Amino acid sequence: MIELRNLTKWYPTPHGRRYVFRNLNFRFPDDVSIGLIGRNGAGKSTLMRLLGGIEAPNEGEVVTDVSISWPVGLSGGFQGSLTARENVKFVCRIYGTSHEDMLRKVRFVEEFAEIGEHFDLPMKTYSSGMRSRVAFGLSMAFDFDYYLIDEAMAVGDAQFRAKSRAVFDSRVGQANMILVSHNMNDIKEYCDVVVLVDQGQATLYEDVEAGIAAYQGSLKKAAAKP
Amino acid sequence: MIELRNLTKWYPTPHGRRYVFRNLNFRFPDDVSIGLIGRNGAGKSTLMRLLGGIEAPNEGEVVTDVSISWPVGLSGGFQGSLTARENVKFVCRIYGTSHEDMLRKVRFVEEFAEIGEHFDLPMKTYSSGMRSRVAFGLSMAFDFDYYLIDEAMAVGDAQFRAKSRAVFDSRVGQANMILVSHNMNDIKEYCDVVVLVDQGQATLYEDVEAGIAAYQGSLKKAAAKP
Amino acid sequence: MKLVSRLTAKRLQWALVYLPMLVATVYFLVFSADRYVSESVITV
Amino acid sequence: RSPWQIQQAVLFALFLRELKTRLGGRWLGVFWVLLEPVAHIAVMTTLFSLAHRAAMPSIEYPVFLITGLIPFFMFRGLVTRLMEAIDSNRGLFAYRQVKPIDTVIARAMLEISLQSIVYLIALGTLGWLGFHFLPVRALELAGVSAVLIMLGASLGLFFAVVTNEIPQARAIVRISLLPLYFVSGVIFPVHTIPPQYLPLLQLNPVLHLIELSRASFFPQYRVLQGINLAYPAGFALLSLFLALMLYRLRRHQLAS
Amino acid sequence: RSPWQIQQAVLFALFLRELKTRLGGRWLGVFWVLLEPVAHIAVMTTLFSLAHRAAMPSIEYPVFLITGLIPFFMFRGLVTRLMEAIDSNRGLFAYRQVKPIDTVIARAMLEISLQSIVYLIALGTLGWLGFHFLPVRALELAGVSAVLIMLGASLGLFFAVVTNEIPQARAIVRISLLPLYFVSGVIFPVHTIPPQYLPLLQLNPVLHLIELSRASFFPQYRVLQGINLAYPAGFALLSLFLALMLYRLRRHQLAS
Amino acid sequence: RRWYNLATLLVVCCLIYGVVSLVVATIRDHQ
Amino acid sequence: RRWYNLATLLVVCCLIYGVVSLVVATIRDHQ
Amino acid sequence: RRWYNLATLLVVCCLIYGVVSLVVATIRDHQD
Amino acid sequence: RRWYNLATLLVVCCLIYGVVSLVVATIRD
Ligand SMILES: CCCCCCCCCCCC(=O)O[C@@H](COC(=O)CCCCCCCCCC)COP(=O)(O)OC[C@H](O)CO[C@@]1(C(=O)O)C[C@H](O)[C@@H](O)[C@H]([C@@H](O)CO)O1
């Protein structure tokens, strides 16, 4: 179960406290695929950071009895100076796995990276898509109950997407994937329920198309406001 | 006229000197739109930085009798603690314009910024989009013979792209823009000549489609190598 | 290599704590000998 | 899992990380750490050996300087390294297990281990050269050193919590640390200090701890009037309480 | 446009840049550079007022301390900040007409301006408090100060060029500025120490420059043997030549 | 002087109990 | 001093045990 | 010198008030 | 003092081995 109790997150601004969320109490549905959608600036990034633990909420708490992964494709969870293998070492020792499984996961991230000698080179010299490949390898190497993805489709080349959806379908069914994507067809295909974030409030829809209609109506109301 | 005489640029690596370019002599064609294409890691970013003067070549020189602008969308040309207006002041103060042109350029940057009161705030609290918009405003607040773009198309929302291309179409004809993009259709539309970078060597193609065919053949040869 | 692999917590605890304490225990309480001290204070 | 086992996991992880960053990777920093005390001895002993022999003829100068310096170096490290603990590990502060208290605890453990190793090495070297290197009273010296540990770690945590913002203020920490090397009885005995400067000199807890450690080290060492353990012990206890309370207030505000 | 005009414009631009990044906008830097000296004369006085009045009962201690302190502050600031200029402004350059030497000499000229302002303020308040505040030979003082400024700027540029890609060595330079304050005749008259220590201390050019600056300030001031200006002049000339030649070698480098 | 040590030791146990409670709270923060 | 020496020996033994344990854990993880 | 003792009483009462306020805030944070 | 000289010679030789190995490791890269 995933729950947000009295959640309140804001950013410091010179004009005051810009509240992104305030007293947000909401329970995520169980064993279903979740599509988190919303307007730009409505707090989708803030909420996926709070779900993944990237940001600490000012008030309230997140109650979760299962394992939630970090967002896939984000490069802000690593350090530039060390080489890629050293970052895999770092994340493995934070999670604290056995040495044999440590070596196996290094082998797996080497396999899914397809990187070469730059695997022994520091991350500060990497490019955007290659850092995204490193992040994908670190995210996939593990086994997680819930996977957070902030629209990682539009990274890398076509072959990267091919292997991505291949191992995705390999992992389909053993975990529930939360997707924050502006591609609404992806929300149709890869999700079971729709949670929309608007004005700091999250609304749940068991039917995907109901959330589609609600989001489209909200966009039309925003556009029609004079 | 842009010419590269005996250019040799490399990066320090623990394994030795990784030569990116070595004795690169090449003359860019005049009064034409240039499309810089090449493989990943072939040196497009490094050569583009050398053209913009971002990095200093170890040997050789860059001979240019016209004005070449910095890459559009790059956020590494400013200072974090200064505000946006202070960064405008800094840039123009190297460039050294008159006070009327000072105030007009500040107003133009504020106009193309569409950021608001955060325009009076330091950029250390900015997001990537805000810094990219500031860079675009600075790259446009001036008048140059040649403009450098490191695939700045896929930054920002749709209205940002529409406004950027509107001012672009205002500025076509009076300058030659060099674009480094993986979108080959953009290379077709916005360029007249093609410069292909491979193995530290630049090959010139007066026909765009000839350079496209050469790049496709190079990619096929790289993929077919066992 | 394998030499540092056999240095488990129990083996290191034995080789560094319990044996020194044990040898000190068997020496000081029974094997030791009393040494009386007499003190004087002089000057010239 | 229990909080205790995940605590050992996370502290071991940050301990090996901190060993990596402080030692430079190739284990080059050990030479620096070993070379500062001996360089201090070489500078210190060449001007005041005769003065000390006139002052306290019964005590050898190098052992006096070891006992005066290495605890002070340990305290200075415990303050400085732990004050700047948050900024160094800032980029990896969002893993739900990497709270700042673990970072400061890991830095403290690393510094204690390193300086204890240096203490043992220096004592062995002193014994190897024919000096006097066995403390007559061992566990009282250990207790005084533990009081010094508690005071130093408490002050470091307090300064790290208080100065999370305004890092410029960190300057008036380390700049203020340099006079503490001179005013406390580290390099020259406070026996020669005129009594009219003595009262304010008693306000330094580090002076009390250094003097008590030296008294517990050497045989027949005299302590000055007004030196006691109660004042530095109370200072350490109060500072630890204040630092823990201040960290508990601003626990959630040290994440970015 | 002539290269001289380009140099003028670029040095003015990064002078404003440096002025901002040094005083921080809030102008707290002027507060610190006005309060650090008066702190030094405060503590230094309350230490050795009686000692100085017994050593040379002809010159008041505060004016001696000012004349020995402010040039040393200028020299230290020159060395440190002209060393750190390239590391600070690595984000700069890359836009043509900007070279490392521009940032180096901009930091230099800011340092001389600030320290000359502080010197004038100090002389003004010294005259305001009923102390001797007018040099008897101002031209010699100007020449000695120019020699010291040239030596400091040249050494700073030399260390900025040499210790590129090795930042840790910079720290060593910082710590070697600590003995100089205690050895270059700044806080106490140098005639007190025995002459057997004297010849080694003659290898320090800063002691020669400070003593010659003092000799050009007070009337009937005593200068001891071997304090000629030829040695500091040659030191400054050689250091400037080496620094300029090394910068010319690593000119196309140093730009990221 | 009985009341002096009574008050001093009361302050000491209050401080020690507070320190231990804060330490165990920080330990139990991890879940 | 029998119990005295036992106490000091136990303290130093615990200290060297802790330092050596940290060292062996470090070298085991490094390999 | 009544004003002098009042002046010291100002700062000692302010210190006591600050310390007890911090303790109360700690207890309140513990009661969340 | 044959054992004493042997032990201190071991110490200095090991120290010089360590410093030359550190120098070699720094200059190999
Ligand atoms: C709790 C306050 C107590 C104040 C004590 C003052 C005494 C003198 C201290 C020396 C003051 C000092 O700094 O040391 C000097 C040399 O010291 C000595 O030889 C001491 C000789 C005798 C003293 C010992 C005898 C003790 C006898 C009984 C007490 C060079 O050290 P250093 O190379 O590290 O200097 C670096 C700067 O300090 C950097 O600081 C900055 C700045 O200037 O750029 C940085 C930044 O700008 C900002 O953070 C910061 C500012 O803005 C924020 O206030 O100033």
Side-chain angles (χ1 to χ4, degrees):
Chain A
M1 41 175 267
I2 303 167
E3 201 176 7
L4 320 168
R5 282 307 105 178
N6 311 133
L7 179 128
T8 297
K9 181 60 185 183
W10 49 265
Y11 292 101
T13 62
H15 306 298
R17 268 70 58 212
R18 181 175 173 176
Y19 281 88
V20 190
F21 301 95
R22 195 175 182 182
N23 201 16
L24 183 65
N25 304 272
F26 181 74
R27 185 176 185 184
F28 277 36
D30 296 338
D31 58 63
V32 288
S33 293
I34 305 163
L36 193 73
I37 61 175
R39 302 179 187 178
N40 289 342
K44 299 187 300 295
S45 294
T46 312
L47 207 36
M48 52 76 88
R49 282 176 287 186
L50 292 181
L51 285 176
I54 297 177
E55 285 191 350
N58 303 101
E59 288 173 8
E61 66 176 340
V62 184
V63 187
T64 289
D65 57 348
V66 296
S67 56
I68 303 174
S69 78
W70 58 94
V72 181
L74 194 70
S75 50
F78 327 111
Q79 215 274 317
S81 67
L82 318 86
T83 67
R85 35 165 314 157
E86 287 155 330
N87 299 37
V88 201
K89 290 185 169 186
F90 146 76
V91 293
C92 287
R93 310 329 311 137
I94 310 309
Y95 276 88
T97 62
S98 73
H99 220 310
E100 49 272 28
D101 169 47
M102 161 55 207
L103 300 183
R104 300 186 215 136
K105 284 181 186 290
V106 165
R107 152 83 279 159
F108 306 143
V109 71
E110 189 40 292
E111 273 172 359
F112 315 137
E114 303 99 359
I115 181 183
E117 299 184 352
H118 302 78
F119 189 91
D120 295 314
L121 294 180
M123 183 145 188
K124 60 186 179 180
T125 68
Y126 285 6
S127 81
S128 61
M130 162 205 326
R131 296 179 279 262
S132 188
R133 282 218 315 279
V134 165
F136 197 161
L138 267 68
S139 61
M140 156 66 210
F142 268 34
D143 298 318
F144 257 112
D145 291 315
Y146 282 80
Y147 284 89
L148 282 176
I149 298 173
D150 195 3
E151 207 165 359
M153 328 304 97
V155 306
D157 38 25
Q159 196 180 6
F160 189 25
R161 313 319 305 129
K163 44 186 52 48
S164 306
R165 326 294 83 202
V167 197
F168 211 156
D169 295 345
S170 85
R171 284 321 101 206
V172 152
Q174 299 168 9
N176 308 119
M177 329 306 181
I178 312 105
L179 169 69
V180 185
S181 173
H182 299 288
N183 200 348
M184 178 134 267
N185 293 333
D186 296 345
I187 308 295
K188 288 178 187 177
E189 186 177 354
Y190 296 105
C191 310
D192 201 328
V193 295
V194 159
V195 183
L196 51 90
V197 181
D198 191 36
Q199 303 184 337
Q201 298 292 334
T203 316
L204 175 64
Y205 292 82
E206 299 184 355
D207 185 25
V208 174
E209 306 291 329
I212 298 179
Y215 178 54
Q216 283 167 339
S218 69
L219 286 181
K220 285 183 184 179
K221 284 176 187 177
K225 268 187 182 182
Chain B
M1 154 258 279
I2 306 169
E3 195 176 5
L4 262 206
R5 298 183 185 174
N6 311 133
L7 179 127
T8 298
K9 181 59 185 184
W10 50 266
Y11 290 103
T13 63
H15 300 296
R17 286 183 172 176
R18 182 179 173 180
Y19 280 85
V20 190
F21 321 113
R22 196 175 183 182
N23 202 15
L24 181 63
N25 305 269
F26 180 71
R27 185 173 187 182
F28 287 83
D30 295 337
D31 57 62
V32 287
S33 294
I34 300 167
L36 193 73
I37 64 173
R39 301 180 186 178
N40 288 343
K44 298 191 298 293
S45 293
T46 315
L47 185 76
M48 143 54 87
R49 283 177 288 187
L50 293 182
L51 284 178
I54 290 179
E55 288 188 351
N58 303 103
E59 288 172 9
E61 68 174 342
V62 184
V63 187
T64 284
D65 49 349
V66 292
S67 52
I68 304 178
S69 78
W70 57 98
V72 181
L74 195 69
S75 49
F78 329 110
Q79 207 273 320
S81 70
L82 286 181
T83 62
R85 38 163 313 155
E86 285 160 333
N87 286 293
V88 183
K89 291 194 167 188
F90 140 73
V91 167
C92 75
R93 275 222 153 277
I94 320 89
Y95 274 88
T97 64
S98 76
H99 256 280
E100 182 42 65
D101 309 357
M102 178 55 188
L103 302 181
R104 103 189 207 286
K105 283 178 188 284
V106 167
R107 287 193 307 275
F108 293 159
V109 171
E110 188 185 17
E111 279 168 5
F112 315 136
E114 57 268 12
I115 166 178
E117 294 165 346
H118 294 79
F119 152 82
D120 289 311
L121 305 184
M123 86 201 306
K124 61 184 179 181
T125 69
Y126 285 9
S127 86
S128 59
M130 332 315 297
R131 298 181 284 260
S132 187
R133 282 220 311 278
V134 167
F136 141 70
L138 292 195
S139 303
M140 174 52 78
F142 287 41
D143 297 319
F144 279 66
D145 293 314
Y146 286 82
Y147 285 87
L148 289 184
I149 300 176
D150 309 21
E151 207 167 1
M153 283 326 101
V155 186
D157 41 24
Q159 193 181 5
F160 188 26
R161 314 322 305 128
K163 209 54 217 83
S164 307
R165 300 293 78 65
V167 196
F168 212 136
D169 295 344
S170 83
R171 283 322 102 209
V172 315
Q174 299 169 9
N176 312 119
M177 291 55 78
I178 307 104
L179 167 69
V180 183
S181 172
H182 299 287
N183 201 348
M184 262 195 288
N185 296 332
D186 297 345
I187 310 296
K188 288 175 187 176
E189 185 179 354
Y190 295 105
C191 311
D192 311 308
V193 294
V194 159
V195 181
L196 172 67
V197 181
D198 192 38
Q199 302 181 335
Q201 298 293 334
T203 313
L204 176 64
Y205 304 89
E206 298 186 355
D207 184 26
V208 175
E209 307 292 330
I212 301 181
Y215 180 54
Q216 281 167 338
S218 70
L219 287 181
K220 286 182 184 180
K221 285 175 187 177
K225 266 187 181 181
Chain C
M1 306 207 157
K2 291 177 192 168
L3 267 77
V4 317
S5 73
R6 76 200 53 176
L7 301 203
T8 167
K10 186 93 104 185
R11 275 213 99 187
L12 214 61
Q13 251 170 303
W14 275 109
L16 259 194
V17 171
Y18 306 90
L19 291 287
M21 291 315 307
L22 229 48
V23 302
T25 326
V26 48
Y27 175 103
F28 274 119
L29 297 309
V30 53
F31 270 40
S32 85
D34 285 17
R35 294 204 304 280
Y36 311 100
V37 177
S38 100
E39 146 198 354
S40 97
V41 172
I42 57 200
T43 317
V44 193
Chain D
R1 294 117 61 80
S2 79
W4 192 214
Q5 60 199 87
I6 68 183
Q7 213 64 0
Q8 287 92 32
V10 68
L11 279 308
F12 283 30
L14 283 104
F15 173 71
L16 49 91
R17 174 51 151 180
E18 262 273 347
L19 200 53
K20 168 60 219 72
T21 166
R22 183 165 163 82
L23 266 281
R26 68 210 74 80
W27 293 57
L28 164 145
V30 283
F31 275 27
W32 200 327
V33 178
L34 260 293
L35 259 44
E36 310 315 280
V38 51
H40 264 264
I41 283 186
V43 179
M44 272 325 307
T45 196
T46 54
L47 318 89
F48 323 120
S49 294
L50 293 325
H52 186 244
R53 283 204 89 80
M56 301 166 56
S58 42
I59 294 314
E60 287 119 319
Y61 200 96
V63 50
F64 181 87
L65 267 281
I66 286 312
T67 68
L69 280 157
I70 312 298
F72 187 82
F73 278 174
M74 201 205 278
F75 164 80
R76 182 200 75 201
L78 267 198
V79 174
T80 50
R81 307 278 305 167
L82 273 93
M83 143 187 51
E84 224 264 349
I86 317 299
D87 312 0
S88 308
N89 309 4
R90 186 79 79 167
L92 296 323
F93 251 115
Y95 273 51
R96 196 61 189 243
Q97 52 208 290
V98 304
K99 329 274 179 40
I101 185 77
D102 324 289
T103 86
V104 294
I105 285 182
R107 251 150 183 276
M109 292 182 351
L110 192 136
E111 195 79 297
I112 295 326
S113 34
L114 271 204
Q115 298 305 319
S116 57
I117 277 178
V118 174
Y119 213 42
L120 289 199
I121 289 309
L123 288 197
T125 278
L126 271 193
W128 203 251
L129 294 214
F131 282 94
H132 156 83
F133 79 119
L134 268 282
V136 291
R137 320 225 62 78
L139 73 159
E140 311 86 300
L141 171 63
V144 171
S145 289
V147 172
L148 178 79
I149 299 313
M150 171 205 298
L151 155 73
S154 98
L155 268 183
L157 171 63
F158 168 78
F159 280 139
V161 166
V162 155
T163 84
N164 184 10
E165 311 86 300
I166 46 147
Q168 165 128 359
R170 298 191 212 282
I172 66 96
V173 166
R174 324 162 301 270
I175 304 306
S176 50
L177 223 40
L178 194 49
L180 274 167
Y181 174 109
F182 289 87
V183 57
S184 48
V186 174
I187 52 133
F188 210 59
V190 290
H191 296 23
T192 82
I193 291 308
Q196 52 83 39
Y197 283 160
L198 218 40
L200 164 155
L201 265 279
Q202 304 284 79
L203 284 208
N204 194 355
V206 199
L207 177 136
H208 291 301
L209 296 181
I210 289 294
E211 284 283 282
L212 288 203
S213 149
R214 286 222 199 89
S216 153
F217 193 90
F218 296 105
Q220 173 263 359
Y221 187 100
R222 60 166 291 99
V223 298
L224 292 294
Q225 293 313 359
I227 313 281
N228 42 16
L229 191 92
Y231 173 48
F235 208 107
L237 198 55
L238 267 173
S239 65
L240 177 55
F241 186 58
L242 259 281
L244 277 167
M245 260 176 23
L246 283 190
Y247 171 73
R248 275 305 277 194
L249 271 283
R250 319 211 142 269
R251 162 178 77 263
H252 303 297
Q253 293 74 330
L254 328 165
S256 69
Chain E
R1 189 193 282 179
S2 160
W4 174 245
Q5 274 86 324
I6 304 160
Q7 218 63 44
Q8 286 226 4
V10 71
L11 280 293
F12 283 50
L14 303 68
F15 176 79
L16 322 174
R17 155 42 71 71
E18 285 288 358
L19 195 166
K20 171 56 181 301
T21 200
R22 169 66 180 284
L23 294 320
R26 327 291 330 264
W27 330 100
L28 196 134
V30 317
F31 203 69
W32 180 218
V33 304
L34 262 306
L35 267 274
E36 144 167 63
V38 303
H40 267 113
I41 321 95
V43 179
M44 275 305 318
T45 297
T46 182
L47 268 292
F48 323 120
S49 311
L50 207 182
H52 176 73
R53 101 163 55 94
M56 331 184 69
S58 71
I59 39 183
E60 319 103 304
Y61 201 31
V63 54
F64 175 88
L65 250 170
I66 284 323
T67 60
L69 250 169
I70 307 288
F72 186 76
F73 275 172
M74 161 145 58
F75 167 76
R76 151 171 83 76
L78 278 180
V79 163
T80 54
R81 314 200 98 113
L82 282 103
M83 146 191 310
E84 301 305 18
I86 307 310
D87 269 357
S88 186
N89 301 18
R90 201 54 139 280
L92 258 283
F93 321 119
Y95 330 131
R96 219 198 314 127
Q97 323 106 29
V98 192
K99 314 298 170 100
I101 221 68
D102 306 340
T103 85
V104 165
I105 64 190
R107 277 222 178 182
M109 74 172 41
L110 164 156
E111 205 39 69
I112 308 115
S113 77
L114 266 189
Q115 291 313 310
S116 88
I117 277 182
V118 175
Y119 207 40
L120 284 207
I121 275 163
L123 291 194
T125 166
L126 263 197
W128 203 255
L129 291 201
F131 283 104
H132 157 108
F133 78 113
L134 271 193
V136 294
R137 323 290 294 192
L139 257 193
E140 283 87 319
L141 193 32
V144 170
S145 294
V147 167
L148 174 57
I149 277 164
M150 156 154 86
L151 154 73
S154 74
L155 257 191
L157 151 63
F158 167 77
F159 272 133
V161 170
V162 153
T163 89
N164 193 55
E165 312 151 33
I166 311 112
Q168 51 265 50
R170 295 161 149 75
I172 328 178
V173 171
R174 293 218 76 255
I175 85 155
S176 34
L177 286 201
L178 256 283
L180 253 51
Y181 174 110
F182 284 90
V183 82
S184 50
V186 164
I187 40 185
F188 213 55
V190 86
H191 331 110
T192 64
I193 43 175
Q196 74 94 340
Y197 273 60
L198 264 187
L200 173 48
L201 294 207
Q202 309 281 70
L203 284 320
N204 194 359
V206 196
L207 185 174
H208 293 238
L209 287 168
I210 291 294
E211 272 309 307
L212 282 198
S213 153
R214 292 220 192 93
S216 151
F217 204 99
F218 308 99
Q220 208 95 312
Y221 182 73
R222 174 101 60 71
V223 55
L224 59 145
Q225 305 294 333
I227 324 288
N228 43 6
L229 188 76
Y231 173 59
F235 210 108
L237 201 49
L238 265 188
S239 99
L240 189 45
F241 199 41
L242 273 198
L244 276 179
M245 276 178 28
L246 277 181
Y247 168 77
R248 277 299 294 191
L249 268 282
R250 317 217 216 292
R251 169 178 25 96
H252 293 307
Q253 227 269 351
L254 308 185
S256 189
Chain F
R1 165 32 51 201
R2 287 104 176 237
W3 300 116
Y4 187 27
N5 318 67
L6 263 306
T8 304
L9 166 58
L10 159 71
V11 169
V12 161
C13 318
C14 282
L15 289 166
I16 274 188
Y17 155 73
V19 152
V20 173
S21 96
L22 292 183
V23 152
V24 301
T26 45
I27 275 191
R28 282 214 293 265
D29 156 78
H30 292 246
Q31 59 99 19
Chain G
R1 315 155 303 196
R2 289 155 170 102
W3 303 110
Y4 192 103
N5 283 330
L6 290 183
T8 88
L9 184 55
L10 178 53
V11 155
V12 50
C13 266
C14 261
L15 183 31
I16 168 75
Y17 164 41
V19 162
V20 155
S21 265
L22 280 205
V23 169
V24 55
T26 278
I27 185 45
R28 146 166 40 198
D29 199 275
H30 150 265
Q31 293 288 322
Chain H
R1 291 112 47 82
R2 299 132 173 136
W3 313 118
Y4 194 86
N5 313 87
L6 290 177
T8 87
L9 251 179
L10 265 276
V11 317
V12 70
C13 293
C14 288
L15 253 72
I16 284 279
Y17 164 51
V19 165
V20 302
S21 306
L22 287 205
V23 157
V24 159
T26 279
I27 277 304
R28 245 208 271 275
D29 208 307
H30 189 19
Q31 292 279 302
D32 61 341
Chain I
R1 331 179 55 208
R2 309 148 148 109
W3 301 115
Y4 179 71
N5 297 105
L6 276 171
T8 178
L9 192 75
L10 180 61
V11 152
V12 47
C13 287
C14 285
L15 164 155
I16 208 168
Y17 174 26
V19 71
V20 77
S21 161
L22 263 280
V23 163
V24 158
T26 48
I27 66 175
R28 278 318 87 196
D29 302 297

